[PDB]
């Protein structure tokens, strides 16, 4: 007679899981767009590095 | 016909060695070259594995290039009847290619059937897991045995006059014991009594053991035959002729050169079957596998 | 882990003789060994290194064909001999493990060495001290000067210090003259740069009296420094 | 050697001998005969296991100069289709099931018996998409209690579409038939068949005639000639 | 009885809620809002260096911390730790159960973790006074293979099995402090966040999940996918993650709002994903595909941008060094390459 115990389990993680705040879509998107933006010239593999200082030449 | 190299030496110059050599030559360097130059490329570019028994079959597609490469000058030698115009380096190197490919190609014909031998009887042996860097320093030796026996061919001044033309030729019936008729024979009667013992081996323990019952291990047997098949018929015409020549002037001394007027005619015929090989050789050992 | 040495002792002028250390506590087998002599009161120099594997071995010029290094790997010892003897062979000898990888420290622990006592171009260090009397609670400092640059391509300096008590064996401080060795207290530190290098330390305790001694491990033979000495 | 420092050729020389130690203890693993044991539970596993006795579980006995070394896995319960890969290169599958089992149905499921639940294994087993040039030896176990267990009820209860005298040898030649007629590759794949009951020495031999079948084919196929 | 039959309905009206929440939250897609900026040119990447040694298939591998040294892990029934600057060899650990699958190097540098397929998670200890590599702690307490296991700090690690549970150990005492529950299928991966406070999942039940290292209990769940969930991956501003299936398709999916964001994927690739990585500045998407040879991908606007096809079977393990200097991808050939 376990299966209302796993049903009572189940059914209390998704009333937790319903109780969260969530964003726009867009706003995501702007966040990703902003720190892709403000760190591309940190990465050798995006802009690449002259070949003088990498330590793989 | 007796003529002085430096020795008491019979030479003939027939009128049929045109009709018939040039033709054969012809046939057996038009297929040989793309059909062991095909082996060649596809051993080298197109293939990606390079166990220690594919390292052996590639020194017998180069052991038998080389002796495709150094017909049409030997080819040329026979249309103008012994007529030697390319002068004397490249006839110390006409006759050294053909005297150390020939040599260098019965050892590694002798090695695929010792290797299958352990490969068949002897399974789960030592021999049958070496590395292929192990198994090209055996390579390495081998063309370095088949190169210390065949030297000898350049350091002597090898153009001679005939008279009126030049001729370049290793083989000549002549009086005084020779290292070259010798390693003729012995590079014959060794590696027959190698490979007869191995073929014949496998062949019966896959039987005793109920194995050739499989539609793919029955054909590996017939495979297993032709190989030693044609080795009689290719190598063995022209072993009999040199015994004869051997017997000929043992009877006799080399007073009347009459006597060989025929037998050395057939000799050069004969001998053209050694070549054969070079060119049926990757069509049943590469191809047909 | 520790080493022991035995063999020393009272020689004759011209004769020979053999050292031997016993290694018990860690993997003898994967360890590179060097001999280090020291002379009385006089600095302490190298001898000779012997590879893991056995493969390689490095003399010095003062002793290149009469010393010989050996090594019983399966037994856990290694082995000098002496062939041919001087009277500026007297010294202390010890023996010293290290293991070269990429981050390792080498010449970590220093053995206790034997008493050897007998009848009777290379880079230039240099330690211009000679005393530094000091009382405990204030910081000193000691300096140390190359004829040549310690700095390699790769960024890495081969400067390493380290400090010899008085009546013990010396002990590891610092290698590449950044990196400080493992059981110290960080009041020790060293910098520098080029060829002027300089070992700090800021808390004084009454511990620290000893000898002070700067080395170079760009290329051997290794040469060693003076004795800077501290008094309370 | 000539760019390199001091402190950088002495790291070249222990990568040297990591290199050695590495080769030289790859040799060894390579001239042993690595068998995947499988079963359908209590059809005689571990009886076989102690007849030829010296998560996963390792067994590892010699015959005649051979290390063997035989992985069991049937304490896993996980799914099966994220770890059957390791076992690419085994060289042969020891199938045992048990035929004194005809009759008696899996207590899981009561419609259905034993003996299809194995054949249903051995299907899936004998037709993966990894084990295609992999040779399976398979072991019918506990033919004792089979000829007291026959006469007393046939096997067409166990096999419906049948006809024949219920005796003992047809009976097992039957069964034979019916799993190796579960093969689908027939030209990169021989199934090896044998009885055993409790017997010693036979089963060992058993194995190691089919393992030598096995190393020679594949001995053979790496000249070409075959 | 009635008290299941209700409880499930009551299941189902939640799933019905929770869907139109996370439908009424969806308003722009990021391929939309990323239709302004400009795409990033071709890649070209070329083989530095080759790390030969390993004479089996390799399972796993990871980046030291100081991006110079990485771990890798084979059936071999070995651990190599190797220099990338230089190809050499610093350690080489033997194992006791061959059957290896995972591989973690600590965030200090001194420890080591090795398992799977045996029920154990070993620890190794790198820096001991004796000059050599002995095992440290045996930890053991699951039921199924491990798949993952990843440094939480010096002296903690979270592992995830093939029994449906992942599990924090303190490595000192040596007995579980949080189990992790709720997946119904075998979990294959697990990544941590760049505060090492939270950490996701992924199973063999196509679906994902948020736990909570402090709390121990199911955050938030990600559905979308149709077959197993090979690998995944945190973006590095720690708010976004990458799914890499084994339906041939990537996705990306983001913390904050619990949508779908892009995916990725072609119409000539119909075989499934084994590993996925960002790069430094989260601008590239990494992809090792079992058509032997790997894939990168312009994380912005899902349109390739190169391929890095050098390997001679499939690719099992990839990883981007923590300053975007180069990337290691190791394959069932026994090799490993690194390009810059
Ligand atoms: C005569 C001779 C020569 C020789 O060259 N004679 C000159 C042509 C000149 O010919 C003669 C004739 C008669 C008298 C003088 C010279 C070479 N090899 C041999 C062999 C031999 C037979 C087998 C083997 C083994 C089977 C591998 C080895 C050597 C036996 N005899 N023999
Ligand atoms: C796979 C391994 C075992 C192969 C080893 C090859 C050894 C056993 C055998 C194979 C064939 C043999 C060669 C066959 C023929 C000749 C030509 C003869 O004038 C001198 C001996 C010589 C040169 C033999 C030397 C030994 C030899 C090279
Ligand atoms: O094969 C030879 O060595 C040869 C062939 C013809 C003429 N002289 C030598």
Redo the contacts between chains.
């Keep these: 007679t376990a299966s209302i115990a796993q049903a009572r389990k189940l059914v209390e993680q998704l009333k937790m899981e319903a109780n969260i705040d969530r964003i726009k879509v867009s706003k995501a998107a702007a966040d990703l767009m902003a720190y892709c933006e403000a760190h591309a010239k940190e990465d050798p593999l995006l802009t690449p590095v002259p070949a003088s200082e990498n330590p793989f030449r | 016909f007796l003529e002085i190299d430096k020795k008491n030496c019979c030479v003939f110059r027939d009128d049929f060695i045109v009709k018939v050599l040039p033709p054969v030559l012809g046939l057996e360097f038009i297929f040989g070259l793309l059909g062991n130059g095909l082996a060649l490329w596809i051993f080298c570019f197109h293939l990606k594995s390079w166990k220690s028994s594919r390292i052996f079959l590639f020194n017998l597609a180069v052991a038998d290039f080389l002796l495709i490469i150094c017909l049409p000058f030997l080819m040329d030698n026979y249309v103008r009847r012994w007529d030697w115009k390319f002068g004397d380096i490249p006839c110390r190197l006409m006759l050294f290619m053909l005297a150390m490919n020939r040599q260098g190609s019965i050892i590694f014909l002798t090695v695929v059937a010792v290797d299958r031998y352990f490969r068949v009887v002897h399974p789960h042996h030592a021999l049958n897991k070496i590395s292929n860097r192990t198994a090209a320093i055996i390579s390495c030796l081998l063309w370095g045995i088949t190169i210390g026996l065949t030297v000898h061919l350049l350091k002597k001044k090898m153009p001679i006059q005939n008279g009126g033309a030049n001729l370049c030729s290793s083989f000549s019936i002549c009086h005084t014991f020779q290292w070259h008729e010798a390693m003729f024979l012995l590079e014959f009667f060794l590696p027959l009594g190698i490979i007869l013992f191995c073929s014949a081996r496998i062949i019966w323990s896959l039987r005793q053991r109920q194995m050739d019952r499989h539609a793919k291990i029955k054909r590996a047997i017939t495979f297993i035959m032709v190989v030693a098949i044609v080795f009689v018929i290719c190598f063995l015409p022209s072993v009999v002729v040199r015994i004869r020549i051997f017997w000929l002037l043992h009877t006799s001394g080399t007073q009347n050169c009459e006597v060989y007027r025929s037998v050395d005619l057939a000799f050069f015929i004969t001998l053209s079957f050694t070549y054969m090989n070079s060119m049926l050789d990757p069509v049943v050992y590469y191809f047909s596998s | 882990v520790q080493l022991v040495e035995s063999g020393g002792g009272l020689v004759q002028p011209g004769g020979s003789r053999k050292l031997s250390c016993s290694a018990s506590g860690f993997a003898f087998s994967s360890f590179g060994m060097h001999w280090v002599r020291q002379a009385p009161e006089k600095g302490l120099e190298w001898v000779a290194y012997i590879s893991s594997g056995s493969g390689t071995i490095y003399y010095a010029d003062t002793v290149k064909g009469r010393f010989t290094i050996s090594r019983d790997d399966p037994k856990n010892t290694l082995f000098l001999q002496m062939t041919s003897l001087r009277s500026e062979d007297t010294a202390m000898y010890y023996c010293v493990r290290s293991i070269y990888y990429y981050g390792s420290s080498p010449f970590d622990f220093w053995g206790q060495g034997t008493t050897l006592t007998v009848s009777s171009s290379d880079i230039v260090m240099t330690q211009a001290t000679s005393s530094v009397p000091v009382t405990p609670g204030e910081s000193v400092s000691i300096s140390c000067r190359s004829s040549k640059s310690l700095l390699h391509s790769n960024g890495n300096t081969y400067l390493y210090w380290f400090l010899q008590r008085p009546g013990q064996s010396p002990q590891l401080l610092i290698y590449r003259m950044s990196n400080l060795a493992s059981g110290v207290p960080d009041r020790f530190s060293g910098s520098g740069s080029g060829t002027a290098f300089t070992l700090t330390i800021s808390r004084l305790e009454a511990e620290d009296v000893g000898v002070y001694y700067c080395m170079q491990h760009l290329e051997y033979p290794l040469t060693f420094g003076a004795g800077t000495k501290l008094e309370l | 050697g000539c760019?390199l420092?001091?402190?950088?050729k002495?790291?070249?020389?222990?990568?040297k001998?990591?290199?050695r130690?590495?080769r030289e203890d790859?040799?060894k693993?390579?001239?042993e005969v690595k068998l995947l044991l499988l079963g359908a539970g209590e059809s005689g596993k571990n009886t076989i296991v102690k007849q030829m006795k010296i998560?996963?579980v390792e067994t590892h006995f010699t015959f005649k100069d051979?290390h063997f070394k035989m992985f069991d896995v049937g304490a896993?319960?996980?799914?099966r289709k994220?770890?059957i890969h390791?076992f690419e290169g085994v060289t042969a599958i020891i199938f045992c099931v048990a035929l004194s089992d005809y009759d008696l149905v899996l207590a899981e499921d009561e419609e259905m018996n034993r003996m299809h639940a194995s054949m249903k294994l051995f299907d899936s087993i004998c037709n993966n998409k990894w084990f295609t040039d992999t040779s399976i030896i398979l072991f019918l176990n506990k033919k004792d209690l089979f000829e007291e267990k026959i006469k007393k009820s046939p096997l067409t209860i166990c096999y419906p579409e049948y006809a024949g005298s219920n005796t003992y040898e047809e009976a097992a030649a039957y069964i034979q038939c019916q799993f190796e007629d579960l093969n689908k590759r027939k030209?990169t794949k021989?199934i090896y068949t044998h009885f055993t009951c409790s017997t010693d020495t036979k089963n060992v031999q058993f194995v190691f005639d089919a393992v030598?079948?096995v190393?020679?084919?594949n001995?053979?196929k790496?000249?070409?000639?075959? | 009885g009635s008290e299941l039959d209700q409880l499930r309905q009551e299941a189902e009206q939640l799933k019905n809620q929770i869907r139109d929440a996370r439908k009424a939250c969806a308003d722009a897609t990021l391929s939309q809002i990323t239709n302004n900026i400009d795409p990033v040119g071709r890649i070209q990447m070329r083989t530095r260096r080759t790390l030969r040694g390993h004479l089996a298939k390799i399972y796993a591998m990871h980046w030291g911390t100081d991006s110079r040294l990485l771990v890798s892990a084979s059936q071999d029934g070995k651990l190599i730790i190797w220099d990338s600057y230089t190809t050499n060899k610093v350690h080489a650990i033997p194992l006791r159960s061959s059957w290896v699958m995972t591989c973690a190097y600590a965030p200090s540098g001194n420890y080591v973790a090795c398992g799977g397929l045996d029920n154990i998670c070993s620890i190794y200890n790198l820096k001991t006074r004796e000059g050599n590599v002995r095992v440290s702690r045996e930890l053991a307490g699951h039921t199924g293979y491990l798949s993952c296991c990843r440094f939480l700090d010096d002296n903690q690690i979270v592992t995830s099995s093939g029994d449906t549970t992942c599990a924090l150990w303190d490595i000192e005492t040596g007995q579980q402090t949080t189990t992790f529950t709720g997946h119904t299928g075998d979990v294959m991966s697990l990544s941590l966040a760049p505060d090492t406070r939270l950490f996701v999942s992924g199973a063999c039940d196509a679906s994902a999940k948020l736990w909570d290292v402090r709390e121990g209990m199911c955050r938030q769940t990600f559905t979308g996918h149709e077959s197993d969930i090979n690998a995944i991956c945190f973006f590095p501003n720690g708010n976004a993650f990458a799914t890499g299936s084994d339906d041939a398709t990537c996705r990306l999916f983001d913390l904050r709002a619990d949508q779908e964001l892009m995916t990725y994927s072609h119409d000539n690739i119909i075989c499934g994903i084994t590993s996925v990585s960002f790069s430094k500045s989260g601008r590239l998407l990494l992809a090792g595909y079992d058509d032997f040879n790997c894939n990168v991908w312009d994380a912005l606007k899902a349109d390739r941008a190169g391929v890095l096809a050098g390997h001679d079977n499939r690719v099992s393990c990839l990883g981007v060094t923590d300053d975007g200097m180069a990337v290691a991808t190791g394959s069932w050939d026994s090799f490993l390459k690194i390009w810059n």
Excluded: P, Y
């Design positions: 760019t420092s001091a402190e950088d002495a790291a070249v020389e222990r990568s001998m990591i290199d130690n590495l790859g040799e693993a390579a001239r998560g996963i051979l896993q319960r996980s799914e994220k770890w390791c030209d021989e030598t079948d190393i020679i084919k001995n053979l790496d000249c070409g000639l075959f």
